Amino acid sequence: AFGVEERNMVSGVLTLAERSIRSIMTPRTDVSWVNIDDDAATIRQQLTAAPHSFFPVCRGSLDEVVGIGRAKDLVADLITEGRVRRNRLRDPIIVHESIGILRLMDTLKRSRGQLVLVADEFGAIEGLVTPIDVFEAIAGEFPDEDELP
């Protein structure tokens, strides 16, 4: 009744509680984030080149997060107003890496499509996670358009 795919997924589920958030998250070095101080042309190019829809919007560096922006809203602001509208950003959802995957899933269920940032106590961004990252731990890779197929 069941085959290799199911067995692998069941194994995945039974190891979630042992794996770290660090092991599944998109790491700091691969975070795509918008520097609100960049010029409109630069940001616009970045938004179209990335496969992602939500972006931390920050002032000068990744750790200086002002909010989370939706690409489709950001592009509109940048074209018509020449800058990101700060008051249109969503509040970040942020967790510590130590909470583990089961607790993180509860948070992701409440995040309504928004990425979750992983940060230390001093506010340093360690990475970010979405439901896809957890699902991959169960069912295997769903690579982005700019990742190996």
Ligand X SMILES: Nc1ncnc2c1ncn2[C@@H]1O[C@H](COP(=O)(O)OP(=O)(O)O)[C@@H](O)[C@H]1O
Residues in contact with ligand X by the rule CB under 6 A: 26, 30-32, 51-55, 113, 115, 128-130, 132-133, 144
Phi, psi (deg, nearest 5) at residue 75: -60, -40
Show the binding pattern over residues 52-91: x = contacts Mg ion (CB under 5 A), - = does not. ----------------------------------------
Alpha-carbon separation of residue 18 from 15, 36, 85, 110 (angstroms): 5, 38, 41, 23
- Distance, in Å, from the CA atom of 24 to the CA atom of 9, rounded to the nearest integer, reads 16
Which position among 24, 35, 125, 128 is part of the footprint of its own copies (CB under 8 A)? 35
**Residue 147 CB coordination number (10 Å):** 10
Residue 52 assigned ligand-binding role: yes
42 binds, among ligand X, its own copies, Mg ion, none (CB under 5 to 8 A by kind): its own copies
Which position among 27, 60, 82, 113 is part of the footprint of Mg ion (CB under 5 A)? 113
Tell me which residues in 76-95 interact with its own copies (CB under 8 A): 76, 79-82
- Distance, in Å, from the CA atom of 130 to the CA atom of 17, rounded to the nearest integer, reads 17
Helix (H) or strand (E) holding 16: helix 4-16
* Contact positions vs Mg ion (CB under 5 A): 113, 133, 136, 144, 147
Q: Which residues belong to the annotated binding site?
A: 26, 32, 52-54, 130, 133, 136, 144, 147
